[PDB]
Amino acid sequence: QVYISSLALLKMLKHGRAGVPMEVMGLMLGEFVDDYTVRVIDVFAMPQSGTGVSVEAVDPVFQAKMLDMLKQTGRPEMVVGWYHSHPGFGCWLSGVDINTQQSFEALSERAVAVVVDPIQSVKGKVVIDAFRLINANMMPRQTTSNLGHLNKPSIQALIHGLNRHYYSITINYRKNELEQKMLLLTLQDYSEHCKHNESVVKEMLELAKNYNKAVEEEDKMTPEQLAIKNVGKQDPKRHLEEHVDVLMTSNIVQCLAAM
Amino acid sequence: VQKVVVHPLVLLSVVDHFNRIGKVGNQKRVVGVLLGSWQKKVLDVSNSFAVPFDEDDKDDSVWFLDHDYLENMYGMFKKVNARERIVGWYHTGPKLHKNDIAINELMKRYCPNSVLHVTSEIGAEEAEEVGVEHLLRDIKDTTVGTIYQLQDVFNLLPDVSLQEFVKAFYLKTNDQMVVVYLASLIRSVVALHNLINNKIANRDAE
Amino acid sequence: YYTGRLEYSEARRTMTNALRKAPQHTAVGFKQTVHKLLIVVELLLGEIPDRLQFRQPSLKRSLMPYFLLTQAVRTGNLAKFNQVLDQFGEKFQADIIRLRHNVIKTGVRMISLSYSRISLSKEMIDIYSTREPQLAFHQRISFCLDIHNMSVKAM
C-alpha cells in the first residue's frame, strides 16, 4: 500500500539516529492515486526544539519558504504528512496523537505519519509503520485475510490499545539497479608472517596439550553434555579450530598472490 | 591533509537528483553543494540544492546562484542541525573541464577539499548502514552467504634475478607451506574427532 | 594386493591399500606374504633402516630370510649378500645394483681421488630449502588432509 523511495528511509534513519532520543520530527512529500497508496520520495527534516518538540515545529516560514525552495530546485508536488522518530521501545504514540491526529484533516485524509526506530534497529530491517485516523468511526479490502504480519506485532497491551486507533498497513520499497550495484597487498616478513606464525603455533602447542587433557578426561566419567560445555574455563578444542582457521586464510592466500 | 570518506546518503541523493533532471534532453553536469562536518577525513555528509544546470547545451561559460540560497539551505539547516560547513560539490559523470575548476575557484567561498586528486576513498557508512544493509537485497554484497612518470614506472619493474631473490622466495614459500601442512593436520584430527562423535552417537541410536 | 602381485612407483600405495583387511584371517596364503613381500619390494625401491626391524614383531611369520636380505642391503656388500642369495636359494620370489647404489651414495668425499676409487642454483648440498626443493614434500600433507575430508562424508 504505502510506498517509499528509500532515500526517505535513509534520510529518515539519518535524522532519527542523529538526534536520539529527542524525538526528532519532519514531514514528507508525495502524491495520491487511490485509498492509501502513498509514494514517498523525500522526507523534510523540520527543525528541533530544546528537548521537547511538538506542533510548534509546524512553522510558517521554514516549511512554507523551504517548501517553495525545494519546490523550485527539487521536489515539486504537495506534502503527504508528518513523521516521528521513537527511540528505544518501538511504536506507540500516546502524547504524539494529540499533536498529530488532529493535524491530518487540516490538510486532508490523504495524509499519513510514521514512527521509526533508529535504536533497536541495528539491523538492515528497520522498524517502519504508518497509520490511520481511527480516532472515531468504528463503523473493506479482502487483503488475502488481513495482511499477515499485523496479527504478529509485538503484541503488548498499551501498543495494541494504541493499535485500536493506529491500524498500520504496509511499507513497500523501491530501488534501482544503479544504486544497488554502487552499494554492493603484501606485508610479508616485515615482522608480520613470522610473528603471526611464531605466535599461533605456540597456542597450538599448549592448547593442544589442553586438548589432550580434554580427550583424556572426558573419555570416561562424562555425562550431561560435559556439564553443559564447560561454561567455566572456556574453551578447549574449539580454540584449536579457530587457530587453524586463522592462518590458513592468511598464510596461504595473500602469500598465494605473492606468486 | 587526509582523504575523503563516503556516506551513501549523498549518493542516493545525487542519484535521485539525476532521476529528477532526466527529462527530455538535458544530460547536464548538475552542480549542487554539500553540507556536513569538514575536518580530517570526512564526506561533507549531506547534499543541497542545485540551481539546475544549463549553459547553452554545451557552451559552458555561464553560472548559477544564489549565494543567499547557499545560506538558504545551508543557513536553515543550521536551525535543524549545527555541525556542518560547506566544502563538497558534485556534478554528473564522468566528464569535467574548466567549468568545474571555475566553480571550484569562482564559487569557492570555503571548499579547500572537495573531489566527488589524492583524496580518493569511498568510505564505510558509519552508524547508518542500517539504511544500507536493508537496501542491499537482491544480488547482495558478495552474495552474502558466499613521460617522466612512465619513465619512472619501469625503473622498479625488472626482477628475474633468482640468485639471491630467487633463493629467498623459494625459502619463504617452503616455510609457509610447512606451516599449512602442520595445520591442515590438526583440523583433520579434530574433524576426525567429530566423525567418531557422530558414529558413536548414531551407533548408540541403533 | 593381487594387483600388487614390473614397476615400483605405486607398489607402496597399493601396500597401504593392501595391508588393511586381516584382523585374524589365515596362517598360510593370504594373510602372510602380503606384508613381508610388499616391504621387500619397498626395499626393491630402496627404503632402509627406520621402518624395518621394530615393525617386525607384529607378524613374526617365520621371519628368517627377507629380513636377512634387508640388513644385507642395509649394510650393502655383495660378499655376504652372496650367502643370503646362493646359500639360501629357495627363498623364492626370484623376480644387485641396488646394494651397489647404497655405498656409492657416499663417495670418498665427492669425486673420489681424481674420479677413481672403490669403497668395497642452490649451492648447498641437499639439506633443505625455501623454494621448489621442499615445496614438493610440503604439498604432500596438504593433499593428505584434503583426501582425509572423505571423513566428513561419512555419518
Binding site: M248, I252, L256, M259 | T173, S184 | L135, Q139, D146, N149
Partner: peptide
C-alpha cells in the same frame, strides 16, 4: 603452483 595452490 598458482594452479596447484578443496579447502572450502
Amino acid at each position: 603452483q598458482v594452479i596447484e595452490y578443496m579447502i572450502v
